[PDB]
């Protein structure tokens, strides 16, 4: 989220992210958040 | 010295901690169990 250089959309990376706790509450300090329409599990059911 | 394997691929699990080997005058018993 807070990186410096991003990848292009034809050379998009895939980093496997595992073996932690997944805190999704660090997504509020950015620009005023134009897109969070989810297609799966609800945002209120992400922390459980 | 990486003289065990030759080619690498997508890893699934990584783990670093205190080493299993510690300290012919010492017995080291080991039991491995892969269930569920």
UniProtKB/Swiss-Prot annotation, chain A:
Function: Attaches the virion to the cell membrane by interacting with host receptor, initiating the infection. The major receptor is host ACE2. When S2/S2' has been cleaved, binding to the receptor triggers direct fusion at the cell membrane. When S2/S2' has not been cleaved, binding to the receptor results in internalization of the virus by endocytosis using host TFRC and GRM2 and leading to fusion of the virion membrane with the host endosomal membrane. Alternatively, may use NRP1/NRP2 and integrin as entry receptors.
Organism whose genome encodes this protein: Severe acute respiratory syndrome coronavirus 2
Assembly and oligomerization: Binds to host ACE2. RBD also interacts with the N-linked glycan on 'Asn-90' of ACE2. Cleavage of S generates a polybasic C-terminal sequence on S1 that binds to host Neuropilin-1 (NRP1) and Neuropilin-2 (NRP2) receptors. Interacts with host integrin alpha-5/beta-1 (ITGA5:ITGB1) and with ACE2 in complex with integrin alpha-5/beta-1 (ITGA5:ITGB1). May interact via cytoplasmic c-terminus with M protein. May interact (via N-terminus) with host bilirubin and biliverdin, thereby preventing antibody binding to the SARS-CoV-2 spike NTD via an allosteric mechanism.
Effect of residue 2 to Q: Reduced viral infectivity
Glycosylation sites noted in the Swiss-Prot or TrEMBL record: 2
Protein name: Spike protein S1
